[PDB]
Write a protein that binds this ligand. Structure first.
Ligand SMILES: Nc1ncnc2c1ncn2[C@@H]1O[C@H](COP(=O)(O)OP(=O)(O)O)[C@@H](O)[C@H]1O
Ligand SMILES: Nc1ncnc2c1ncn2[C@@H]1O[C@H](COP(=O)(O)OP(=O)(O)O)[C@@H](O)[C@H]1O
Ligand code: BEF
Ligand code: BEF
Ligand code: BEF
Ligand SMILES: [Mg+2]
Ligand SMILES: [Mg+2]
Lengths: 361, 49, 361
């Protein structure tokens, strides 16, 4: 009998193998501390191996033998550089975005905020400004442009119907979700488990993206889980609560030893709460990509409702050739002077004609 | 004799642990723990009147 | 067997020798209170000497003999003026700046804020204003203009890849860093250790420049570490947290008996937080040099994006001759009335022609 799951090490030195729901489950498989010390396993490690039905007085099946860890043999798990010891650098290898049902949006992203592997990216928008739909487009474009990469879709504190839509529209990539019906604790647990799994995979030189809707809601859960910290930050935030979201987001990085973690998360702003704006500003100093969407641009029903001027990346020279870089510089010079809605409509009109390379020509 | 008492108690714990010990890779620690008899010797040389 | 390190005296009367990482390690060398008293060693004192492998039950190596302290014989440690009693003066020894990859930057710095030995300076900029790049230029310029002076780079709460870039671009000078991935505890510890080392060296008549990126993040770590202090200052600051940053900064000074401690630090402003603005104003009352960077100039891609009018020092006469002083006075009078971006463009065009002294003619 074979079982599979993701390793979750308990305080007692023994661990459990989890299912996709990322929670304690009756079918979780026991893993003794002995096996953990044997295979140098770590939280988030994907473990597959023969297991047996629990003996009398055993409530959970036990892993009889370890066969594969993160889809590979356990040996390499003993001798491998630790994720925290991997060198973090800039994303030096870009990804071109294209999704058939909306190529306008993917091309506009390509021209505004090119994506590389190891990206720490963020999209900032008021409610109802193309955020969730845009993230769907990016997921689809990745699953057409970067099939090799372990694409992970994480949905925190968000809408159940959106979970269903993305589950169905992600064509099989790992969609993990925890709706607003769930308490913050479930959100934090699932998010951290997914995070640890991603870091374990990237440890193996693997390429991962985490598409995190509502990183702000994750920060809210982090705040509410922070038990005192003493003083409260202005706007209702806690001083030490944001350390966990900050580390969470800053884990994404380019590795000079292979593989990387690219996290694209969604930020809410202009919500009338100092809390949201403070979270936005705090994460901006950690991220290498910001893409702004304007509420007014939505209100006119012109899409994708992107705020061109505010959007951009850092170190585009590392993801673009000089021709593309100077093209982008020319375009931004042309667009800097003129209004958001007008700018976006005009750009859509120009880009509707041809694919980006021809609109260049 | 306090030494033997400590060894007997240690035999109890190591006995339970070996059966709990799934694999045979349990001799060093899963079989060995000096807390009981060590504290017993302390008890006899300090807590014995 | 020879060992080396920097002395960290613990609460127990015995100390440890550390490496560049500025924390506890397994390889730190034990130093008995007897040796400390014998050679009057203090925290930050650099100790080199023959050591021995630990005996059984010993966990760290012990310094069998002291050979050199602060690169000199231990006897002088007995008879030397203590750092805190060194008479402070104004910086009476200017440092000319020239860095080939951007001599316009160093030139404008010279024409806006001449640098001396013992300078207590600050560069104030919003996010993404070349603050970090300007600090890099200053470092590179010092590493040819003042190769003699012990150049220490302290990066606190900042981007790991920037740490790598400065490590490689500093050409071997002492780069100490503690990224935002670290808790404030690590930041404070490393900063204090580096500071104590610097004061110990300057006590030896030594010259030190500490280029500290993110002094405001250091203040943030101080605020987070401060256990209560009770009442909250406006902006979320703590009343007594800033005491330690203030002392840290005010330590920089001109010594009338030899050596100097100069600290150039990077400050954040226009961040939307009263906290940063209060920190800036509080430090401005202790420093002698301020160089202001404008976000709008960066948005126009005009570098160095300096706010000339807000830029300046105190007691420039001590760092400039009469001809230079009056030339700078003329230059400010002309540029006093001009708009920031346009004034910078004017100055850059005028300086692009030739070297500064040639620009005078
Ligand atoms: N590119 C688009 N094309 C068509 N409809 C869009 C587009 N972007 C957003 N919308 C509309 O906006 C609504 C909510 O968008 P969503 O992105 O979920 O809001 P938010 O940006 O707050 O997540 C949807 O009902 C959808 O019809
Ligand atoms: N002199 C310059 N030359 C080229 N790029 C610059 C210059 N100054 C700033 N930049 C741009 O600004 C960014 C660095 O921001 P930085 O100055 O480190 O932030 P802060 O000013 O808050 O420390 C880089 O991405 C770079 O493109
Ligand atoms: F309500 Be929206 F999706 F932020
Ligand atoms: F974002 Be900058 F480096 F302060
Ligand atoms: F900083 Be001054 F003394 F007002
Ligand atoms: Mg939405
Ligand atoms: Mg910076």
């Amino acid at each position: 009998r074979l079982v599979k799951g993701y390793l979750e090490i308990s305080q007692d030195g023994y661990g459990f193998l989890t299912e996709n729901l990322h929670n304690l489950e009756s079918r979780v498989a026991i893993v003794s501390a002995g096996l953990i010390k044997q295979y140098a396993l770590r939280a988030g490690d994907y473990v597959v191996g023969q297991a047996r039905p629990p003996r009398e007085n055993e409530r959970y099946a036990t892993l009889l033998k370890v066969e594969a860890v993160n889809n590979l043999d356990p040996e390499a798990a003993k001798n491998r550089p630790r994720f925290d010891e991997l060198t973090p650098q800039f994303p030096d290898r870009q990804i071109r975005l294209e999704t058939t049902p909306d190529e306008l949006s993917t091309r506009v992203i390509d021209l505004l905020a090119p994506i590389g592997r190891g990206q720490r990216g963020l999209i900032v928008a008021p409610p109802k400004a193309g955020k969730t739909t845009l993230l769907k487009k990016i997921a689809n474009a990745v699953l057409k442009n970067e099939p090799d990469i372990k694409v992970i879709v994480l949905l925190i504190d968000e809408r159940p119907e959106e979970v269903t839509d993305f589950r169905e529209s992600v064509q099989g990539a790992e969609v993990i979700a925890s709706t607003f019906d769930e308490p913050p604790q479930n959100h934090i647990r699932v998010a951290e488990f997914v995070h640890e799994r991603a870091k374990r995979i990237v440890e193996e030189g693997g390429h991962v993206m985490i598409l995190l809707d509502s990183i702000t809601r994750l920060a809210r859960a982090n705040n509410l889980v922070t038990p005192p910290t003493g003083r409260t930050l202005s706007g209702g935030l806690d001083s030490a609560a944001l350390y966990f979201p900050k580390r969470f987001l800053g884990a994404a990085r380019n590795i000079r030893g292979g593989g990387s973690l690219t996290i694209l998360a969604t930020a809410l702003v202009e919500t009338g709460s100092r809390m949201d704006d403070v979270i936005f500003e705090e994460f901006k100093g950690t991220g290498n990509m910001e893409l702004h969407l304007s509420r007014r641009l939505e209100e006119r029903r012109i899409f994708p409702a992107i705020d061109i001027l505010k959007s951009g990346t850092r170190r585009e020279e590392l993801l673009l050739g000089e021709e593309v870089t100077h093209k982008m510089w020319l375009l931004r010079k042309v667009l800097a002077d003129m209004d958001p809605a007008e700018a976006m409509e005009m750009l859509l009109a120009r880009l509707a004609r041809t694919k980006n390379n021809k609109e260049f020509l | 004799d306090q030494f033997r008492v400590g060894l007997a108690r240690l035999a109890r714990g190591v006995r339970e642990r070996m059966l709990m010990g799934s694999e045979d890779s349990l001799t060093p620690a899963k079989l060995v723990n000096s807390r009981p008899l060590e504290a017993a010797i302390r008890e006899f040389f300090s807590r014995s009147q």
